[PDB]
Protein: protein (protein-tyrosine phosphatase 1B)
Amino acid sequence: MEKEFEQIDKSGSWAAIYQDIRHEASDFPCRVAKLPKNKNRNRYVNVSPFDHSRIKLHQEDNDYINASLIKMEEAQRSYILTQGPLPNTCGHFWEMVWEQKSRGVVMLNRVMEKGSLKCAQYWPQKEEKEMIFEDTNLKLTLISEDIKTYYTVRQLELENLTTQETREILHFHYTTWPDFGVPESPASFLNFLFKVRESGSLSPEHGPVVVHCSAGIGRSGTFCLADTCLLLMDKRKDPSSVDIKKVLLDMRKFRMGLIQTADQLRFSYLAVIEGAKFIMGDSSVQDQWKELSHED
Ligand SMILES: O=C(O)C(=O)Nc1sc2c(c1C(=O)O)CCOC2
Structure:
């Protein structure tokens, strides 16, 4: 992957590699997404969940959210990829976190990017001001947060107002990944991915982690691709048995458009090649990513 990396680089062919991926990627219907009744539940016209893998709300009313379950069979890990909640779907979002039993939410975007409102403000920014979403009958409180220079971990309490059951959700917000961009470095990305992992939220005792950006494909696909490649590498301890592009193709069976530019692809080879030093038995690099990243 490291030789492929250098071959690709030497002969300036990331875009064509990426172009091939786009050409190979699956195509499956998104008919419920396109129901007229769901128009205002989608942020982008051109980014939909395929019907086969979409997440259904457990409501009789309208079961539609723009979210997909990415179920990586071999790696044995799933994620739910979703767009940034809209002003009218923040209640659907948290209904889905409750129903799917997720323990973590990864947000890879800011509420504002390039002058636009990429995502509703769907979690509370302070302890005294909880949010209640009447439509799905759920309450959410900030329990605390831990703000780093490039990301923040929130502990959130989610309450199902109908049964009064309560869960803790962890929110990992990467706030320095530009839309249609890459992270500043592999170090700070792996730093952030490993915070997520250490937290327990990836563990198969939970529902699938919710990963989102603005559309739920570019930055998310990047995160997820790196995570699974490292996972696959780990259950074998065998870096050479991972085919990154092929894994991306597996993921795009479950949601379109995963990874939005050829520099995102290239960044994902960089992140997995670096992270393999850790999977391969050198845990001191984790500490190094933490220094490089400048977390504090
Ligand atoms: O948030 C991302 O990482 C992401 O995939 N963004 C997406 S993918 C995508 C758009 C954007 C965007 O935010 O403007 C606009 C519509 O076309 C595809």
Observations:
- The radius of gyration is 19 Å.
- The chain has one domain: 1-296.
